[PDB]
Design a protein around this ligand. Structure first.
Ligand SMILES: [Cl-]
Ligand SMILES: [Cl-]
Ligand SMILES: [Cl-]
Ligand SMILES: [Cl-]
Ligand SMILES: [Mg+2]
Ligand SMILES: [Mg+2]
Ligand SMILES: [Mg+2]
Ligand SMILES: [Mg+2]
Lengths: 287, 288, 292, 291
């Protein structure tokens, strides 16, 4: 208990091979992930926007993300990695973002080298800031962060500038104070061993679906020197399909009978929540 | 539309036979429901608590619910019914709840006759306030609410006091100013026609799964005099199963291949969000 | 009976029309808004600098929509008095601006002001301000007007006088009105003789910002009205007095081990109860405890 | 000033090293900064302040979120240990637990929770209703069961005016037994009550020196001599702030200009000093001198 969220995350990176980090859009999903046995969870920036019905276009601000993060960390001590896009503004905003995330009991954040009006890392038409501007971002963050807290610098540079230039950026970023590196949308697993060796610090691979990356296995990615594997939206995408199906079912058939087999049971829900321990205490109070 | 949220809800109750109201835990789910063609949506109190990882035991307050409601109404004008439990406190809290819900562009709320430390309406061991205390609650709410805004009084009395006593309560509640009635956990469809006739105002039936009620159809419930049918957690329950499955898959197999067929596609997601209209405008700005 | 059936935007437009000129006073919180209402002001203001400073942050565009929105909601919950809200430069691009407008409307806000500075903005009476070109500001205004209701008031603010001079500032303001701005906020005009020419050229109602310790002399409402100004803003006046008073109480308690010396400078419990209508509530509470 | 210490620890240390510890109310972060600048060692978020600032009466309408939001804003701006009013705990055992956990997460140093019924009122008003000793012990158990060690739970008793000194001491003692760290002796009307109260309860005692209530305003020294360890000034600054604000508004209304108010305003430069504004705007000009 008395270990800091940052420390828990660093320890999960070290002891797992590799550490699988799964996205959760809300506290209950975080609980499901914990129950399944994952050692780290993730708050997706795109998830934050999409869940509000907004596109992933840097419309959201620190408060949209912070509120979602707080809800999660209130429900579980499982170390949480939070997407903070490009830091929500200049040096002062970045400092605020870091301080606030720490205050919200967050374990780690990732900040990237795109320009302000950012987009999904697997989409075309991304624009990057120069190495210097990103170093500035990193300095603002490290200047105010605690030791244990993990800053993951994310580079979106591979698809635009190629492997060599990307490694250069990552190395400068580590130099500037980044703890770990998020190598976004490396298209070939053979890139990783050379990337991981050059940057030295733990590297995260983003195994998102419907992107520019093939879906490799955790084992494969570990063998190529990767320390963290991210599943940013996987559960959310399944959740949406399931929800739509229930709605269609209710609309078409005037009843949800057909959906019942696809629903988690009341008892399983109670299990995840520890509901019975609470209602029992409530009946003892009522007598 | 230039019609108020309350009016939109009243109109949906009148024009549909019956009005199906589906639960949504977040704005995106509300969008899915809208796309499918529902005329009204619902914010479940249990949903609000459970999503935060809390039991449905009246731990949540006005702010927990209000925040979830605001997020939804920001994304859709589809009239929203919001669960406000027992009103979160005394007369003044109830007044605040009503005012705040109106300010959040909510169409209707439901408030129930349980004691403060409330529970799911399909669980055993429920305790009710007397008829007088509930009338007090209703007065506090009606005293500050606009005309169009819909106050649904919910009675949890059937399982404890039986149908006759429940109808009595509901009738007093309508008298005190309730617009509509939420008849919680009526176990038999033959109860409804007598209930609906006695209370006169539109009645909501709660078709929740894994409770004390059989799952009747909308048509059946309409034939028995019911005007609204609620599906409070249906989508949420499916969402949770789907999510757990993805997590298990990723854990066991080190990859999500097996899950792919069970995922909504990027393009369908973009469709629901209108994503393309935004990213196109973004490319036109970068070309200038 | 106007408070009841009229939209916040409409209430603000009506206050601008019926007053000569409309004095708009800053309030940092709901209680201050109530004090202003009690004194008889027809419109109130949420200062962006106030929002930041009250959190202990500098007025340097660090704050986001949520910082301002939360403060605004608290105020509009307590009073129907039309509220003007400072939204800086709109908190981001076209989509953020749209969100800001929609959210402010949802928060029962009457009007906002958005300005032509660059993202990392500063106080309008400080040196070293940087502006976006006319085109970029028109873009901002379009994003806002495209989503706003009719009644809701968009005040375009130009910070251009100190940088580009009166002529260039009038040009900007006129383009801004053309792009859909309802009213104009002429920031930090140094001389009262600037106003009549400014007001005539832009046609729409003009706000003059009578902030202390700035680049403007403190003219009177009457004077500013005579020079064609329709709104006069007192953005931080109360806040500045509040801070001095608070510091003094703290010093007093520190030095003397008791607050005796401060008592004469405190609003009384009874005056507080009056502003809140406290008695009406506690009376109803005793009647509820008596039947139970 | 070094921050490897938990907020609870900082508060306990301030109680021990000061004689007595003056705790001043601040309604917002900026006020907290003013208090810090003046040299106070602990600050306070008033529940009545939270309600009143929203334009609501102090009648238990506010919930955990109203208070939590105000507390977060303060603790973001200063490490100065903050004592937060949590009324009666906002609900049952589970709500209390949530309140405690959330307050800790918000970097709060200490809370005070009282023995009134749910629909509570100002402790210096007539017509207060208390829960029995058992119900309050329940409240305290719910809180202590989830709180960290360093975090300070101050049990407040509102019982003096209703049940008298002896019954109040009994309550306080049971409360300490149930796990309370410190005691808030609300609205003792006479300074001669304190030495007997403080001796009986043993744990540090807070005296509430609020104006326009049922208590005379004694000095810190006096209260210390009578065995009191903390002295609270819950609304003092707020009351002065309100008067000052009203006066500015009257001035602007009557005279069409704020000239008469200028002498009563903190200067731009003093404001900049409290905020460290110049350090930020200077860095901003150095950044603009490349582009
Ligand atoms: Cl926990
Ligand atoms: Cl919408
Ligand atoms: Cl009001
Ligand atoms: Cl700090
Ligand atoms: Mg992202
Ligand atoms: Mg419910
Ligand atoms: Mg401003
Ligand atoms: Mg209090």
């Amino acid at each position: 208990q008395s270990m800091s969220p940052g420390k828990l995350f660093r320890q999960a990176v070290a002891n797992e091979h590799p550490l699988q980090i799964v996205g959760a859009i809300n506290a209950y999903c975080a609980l499901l992930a914990e129950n399944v046995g994952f050692k780290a969870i993730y708050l997706s920036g795109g998830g934050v926007a999409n869940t509000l019905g907004l596109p992933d276009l840097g419309i959201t601000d620190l408060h949209d993300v912070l509120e979602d993060a707080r809800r999660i960390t209130a429900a579980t001590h499982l170390p949480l990695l939070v997407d903070i896009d490009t830091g929500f503004g200049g040096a002062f905003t970045i400092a605020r973002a870091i301080k606030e995330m720490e205050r919200a009991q967050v374990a780690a954040v990732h900040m990237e080298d795109q320009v302000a009006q950012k987009r999904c890392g697997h989409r075309p038409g991304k624009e990057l800031v120069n190495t210097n501007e990103m170093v500035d971002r990193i300095k603002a963050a490290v200047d105010v962060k605690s030791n244990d807290f993990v800053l993951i610098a994310r580079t979106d540079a591979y698809a635009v500038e190629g492997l060599k230039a990307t490694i250069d950026r990552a190395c400068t970023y580590v130099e500037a104070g980044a703890d770990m590196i998020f190598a976004e949308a490396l298209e070939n697993i053979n890139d990783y061993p050379t990337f991981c060796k050059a940057v030295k610090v733990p590297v995260l691979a983003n195994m998102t679906e419907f992107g520019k990356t093939p879906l490799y296995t955790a084992a494969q990615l570990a063998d190529h020197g990767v320390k963290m594997v991210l599943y940013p939206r996987s559960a959310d995408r399944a959740m949406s399909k399931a929800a739509l199906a229930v709605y269609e079912d209710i609309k078409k058939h005037g009843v949800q009978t057909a959906s019942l087999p696809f629903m988690q049971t009341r008892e399983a829900l109670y299990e995840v929540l520890n509901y019975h321990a609470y209602e029992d205490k409530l009946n003892q109070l009522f007598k």
